[PDB]
């Protein structure tokens, strides 16, 4: 399923990478925690520390992120909040 981007402060290349890593994450893992974990760890390695990932069907959030490192999107019913801090 093509991701539905709801909010973002991000460049195109970084966005496509996050979405790709997140789709692959869903095929690998069943638990939301593990899905978030593999996204977070891969981004830390590829783009530097420090990433944080929330994956879920019901949550509200308020966070602070580095400029150009924020995306919030759905893949099917599952929402992904992905962002980087210093």
């Amino acid at each position: 399923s093509t991701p539905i981007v709801k909010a973002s402060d991000i460049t195109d290349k970084l966005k496509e990478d996050i979405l790709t890593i997140s789709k692959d994450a869903l095929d690998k893992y069943q638990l939301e925690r593990d899905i978030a974990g593999t996204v977070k760890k891969q981004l830390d390695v590829k783009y530097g520390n420090t990433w944080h990932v929330i994956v879920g069907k019901n949550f509200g959030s308020y966070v602070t992120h580095e400029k150009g490192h924020f995306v919030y999107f759905y893949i099917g019913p599952l929402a992904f909040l992905v962002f980087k801090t210093a």
Binding site: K57, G60, F70
Partner: peptide, 11 residues
């Protein structure tokens, strides 16, 4: 440089 952001799932 940072920004703050709030989000809310639809379900």
């Amino acid at each position: 440089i940072t920004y703050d952001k709030g989000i809310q799932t639809d379900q």
